[PDB]
Design an enzyme around this catalytic site. Structure first.
Site, short mmCIF file in Angstrom:
data_model
loop_
_atom_site.label_atom_id
_atom_site.label_comp_id
_atom_site.label_asym_id
_atom_site.label_seq_id
_atom_site.Cartn_x
_atom_site.Cartn_y
_atom_site.Cartn_z
NE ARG A 50 -3.76 0.54 2.60
CZ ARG A 50 -3.64 -1.18 3.11
NH1 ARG A 50 -2.29 -1.64 3.60
NH2 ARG A 50 -4.64 -1.94 2.88
NE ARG A 99 7.11 0.39 5.07
CZ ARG A 99 6.51 0.14 6.11
NH1 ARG A 99 6.25 -1.43 6.55
NH2 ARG A 99 5.63 0.78 6.19
CG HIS A 116 5.13 5.08 7.79
ND1 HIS A 116 5.36 5.60 6.76
CD2 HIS A 116 4.50 4.27 7.75
CE1 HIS A 116 4.98 5.37 5.97
NE2 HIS A 116 4.51 4.06 6.60
#
Lengths: 318, 325, 324
Positions: free
Chosen positions: A63, A113, A141
């Site tokens: 996502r 990431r 994050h």
């Protein structure tokens, strides 16, 4: 002064929510709102063409990665993907610092990431180019908190004001120990006039150092009192007078229409996603639910962040 | 700079590039010139979009992330587009289908194909079947032409006289490490030996340069009257092998570890190259030494690959539309 | 050519395309006309950028490289952009998440979605949840509408009269091989049977065409007054089955191997199709035979897919903006 804030943010790496200040935050919020209107009116979204990015995802996190890609592409830029690799297969034997020293010469910026917190920092040190952190193992994050904050701000704009008489009351519900999205957002929210309800079972309580950071930030702006942080065992008490309910990923803390009857009328429901059973599907029809708009907002915020950081130039304006 | 970029482009238009021998003197000058333009344009943050509207396919049938990223970036910086086939080995792609069918078809969707495959067989079958140009991004026989092009481009930035074929300006290069398996050395040797170049092969006995490579070098040096008994030399150790060399090229893989101490008795002007990744072969202390250029070398792959794609795939050349600084 | 491309576009705007039955007569003429423009434009090396500024997601939950590449190419040649979710199976994507959540969300980031998934269930759930159009690029029930569209487009290039519904101009097609598991045959049969078509099903007994497909063909042929006792014929072997057929369609999988010898007693005009890949159902010697068109067929997928995306996602109009 969007020009001035841009000169300051130009080529900034963004690893941690603490890397964003008051001004930078206002900028990001303002810009995100512009991309939102532009996109919902089907207007030209191409405010950042001619950039080439590398997106490096060393864990499955589809996502967030799709959302950054879309943000890049809607801006009119381009992206090369390193994907569906874990941390050792990429870095076959090579040092992180070599891999980013080199990679950094081929692109304008890097979205990274990686479950290893170490690697992102080494990346930042080696890279000649800005890096946006899209999530690591220590629970940094920043774009997630930015989009969380943005969502809250749409319903409760007064959070920006630091007005002694306009306080926001948020309930964070579920796994507060492991829910790093809570830790990050709490840190950001505690910069403002905010009160916290931590709803959790005892072994999944908010960590001490997070409570300290909140207490620290609230004290700094004269918003700390004994009612600032409250701790609950159950929903009925924890949900009482809260503008925002934030559910965490993971029982006793299942959200239903019944459990929502004794909330405020204006309360809005957020969840970083995906949900499993934490929120019953019946709640998606309840106009208090905004978790799908929240996910949608990540596009505008990420577009905003890339725009402010990487434009070498005209600003979005409805 | 020296030469007719339009004419060379008419000759290179739709050329496949499988092997360094597919690139001639003119083509090389062209590539070198164009690579330089892309370097300056990119470092001055100017518009790099010299090849728009092309759609490429990039087919990588082995993990080779750096080369694959570098071609993608090159395509994207040029303003074109790319479809990727990635993280597949040679049998999972070609589920049961013939290589010739796969490429006959794939070739109708795209303007050009970047192909990496451990099988040397497959790249050749691809070239035959494809109705479209193919750039080889590396195969099993050690054909990797963009790697030798970028290597040569790097060398030429420090030692431009290599282009001259001047009897009095000879370049002296040391190739160090695994010379048997280091196919990057074989390729680049083949290219270097077209010019006035002298070779120091530093290796342990079982990892020596292969005989057929020594023959090619000898053959190419003779053809331009640059062969002598001092042209190729063989060493056991660094201190001797590094002596009077403009370039030191380290190979992937000990006794041949590069350090600041081992670099004290090189020439002042010597430049250090390594195709990468390093694993140990070069001590991190060397990165601070201004003799090290292996990170600039890797960087140069972008400009060279942009150059190669530009020269091969431009359809709307006029003399004025070429990159020019 | 014959018809109002503006009007048909207003109707197709934001249409999902899951099944061949989601395309009607007009929609089909439009797709054929537009596919032909893209063919001529691309072969003359002209500007193909008729749909810029779109961002698509392509989601492929099984290995199906050729279809996936062909859609990507179509999107990119149109001048739009694509994000890929690839080389994942159905459970790794949807780590635990509901299909409906995944698509509800995904659908907010992009203009449209290309979806391939072996589960038939999932594609339907996607269609319900998605706020955005979805093109089905193939699922487990054998719905593959762009494959039939490109098959039909190919047939129409050689035998344009199929469009006419003329009692005196009948197309005779032979479908050869595994008719049970060849879903491409099922889809294309369904489409062909909307027109004046006669069917030769060549197969060994256990790999016969399924009954419900025979019923659909029958039903469609009756509806347009083209059904007779000669409409559907069943053969054991090539020599009889290939007899008077305009089109030979070979299926993936023996007794049914196509050679130049077996092609001697076909019509001169007969054209050979295969959805691909072949694995010796067709001898390589046949590629030199001008009756073979299976490579042109594969090539045509690009134009048809470009066509479909253009008609569905261009917003909006215009008389002067159409390919011509």
């Amino acid at each position: 002064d969007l020009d001035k804030i841009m000169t300051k943010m130009k080529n900034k790496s963004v690893i941690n929510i603490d890397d964003v200040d008051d001004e930078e935050l206002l900028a990001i919020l303002y810009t995100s709102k512009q991309f939102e209107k532009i996109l919902k009116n089907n207007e030209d979204s191409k405010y950042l063409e001619n950039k080439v990015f590398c997106s490096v995802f060393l864990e499955p996190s589809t996502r967030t990665r799709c959302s950054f890609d879309a943000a890049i592409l809607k801006l009119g830029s381009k992206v090369l993907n390193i994907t569906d690799m874990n941390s050792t297969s990429f870095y076959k034997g090579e040092t992180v610092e070599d891999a980013f020293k080199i990679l950094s010469t081929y692109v304008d910026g890097i979205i990274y990431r990686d479950p290893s917190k170490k690697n992102v920092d080494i990346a930042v040190s080696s890279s000649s180019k800005p890096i946006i952190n899209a999530g690591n193992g220590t629970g940094e994050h920043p774009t997630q908190s930015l989009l969380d904050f943005y969502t809250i701000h749409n319903y409760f704009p007064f959070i920006l004001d630091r007005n002694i008489n306009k306080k926001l009351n948020i309930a964070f519900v579920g796994d507060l120990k492991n829910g790093r999205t809570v830790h990050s957002l709490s840190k950001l929210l505690s910069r403002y006039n905010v009160s916290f309800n931590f709803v959790s079972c005892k072994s999944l309580n908010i960590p001490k150092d997070i409570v300290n950071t909140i207490t620290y930030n609230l004290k700094k702006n004269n918003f700390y009192s004994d009612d600032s942080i409250k701790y609950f065992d159950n929903l009925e008490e924890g949900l009482e007078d809260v503008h925002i309910i934030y559910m965490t990923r993971i029982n006793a803390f299942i959200l239903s229409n019944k459990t929502l009857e004794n909330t405020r009328d204006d309360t809005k429901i957020l969840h970083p996603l995906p949900r499993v059973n934490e929120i019953k599907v019946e709640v998606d029809s309840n106009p208090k639910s905004v978790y799908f708009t929240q996910a949608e907002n990540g596009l505008y915020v990420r577009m905003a962040l890339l725009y402010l950081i990487f434009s070498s130039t005209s600003h979005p304006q409805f």
